[PDB]
Design a binder for this molecule. Structure first.
Ligand SMILES: Nc1ncnc2c1ncn2[C@@H]1O[C@H](COP(=O)(O)OP(=O)(O)O)[C@@H](O)[C@H]1O
Length: 89
């Protein structure tokens, strides 16, 4: 697993419907990343040449509200089942 800087516009976020993000943690992470940068890269799954992200909601929102183009990611080659497992009620 190689850490890659992926643009924010390429990570599909299917769980944005459940975006109960506390702006306090978001702003704390914004300040910390603006200080020392992102330390824990988010988890991204590649399926059929498309990137999906289910964790790292606060970090993603912080990168968005900080005006940063890319974010560090640890990409895992995934299948249709691990993509379907995350999309199961
Ligand atoms: N530069 C950073 N400053 C502060 N926290 C960071 C940084 N990089 C990664 N993190 C991680 O962000 C997490 C805190 O946000 P959290 O809400 O848990 O993340 P998520 O976005 O997955 O919900 C911690 O697990 C922390 O290790």
């Amino acid at each position: 697993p190689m850490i890659v800087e992926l643009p924010l516009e390429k990570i599909r976020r299917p769980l944005m419907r459940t975006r109960s993000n506390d702006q306090n943690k978001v702003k704390e992470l914004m300040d910390s990343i603006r200080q020392i940068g992102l330390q824990v890269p988010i988890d991204v799954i590649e399926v059929d040449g498309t990137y999906y992200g289910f964790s790292g909601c606060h970090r993603y929102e912080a990168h968005q509200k900080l005006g940063l183009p890319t974010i560090r990611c640890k990409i895992r080659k995934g299948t249709k089942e691990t993509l379907r497992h995350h999309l199961r009620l």
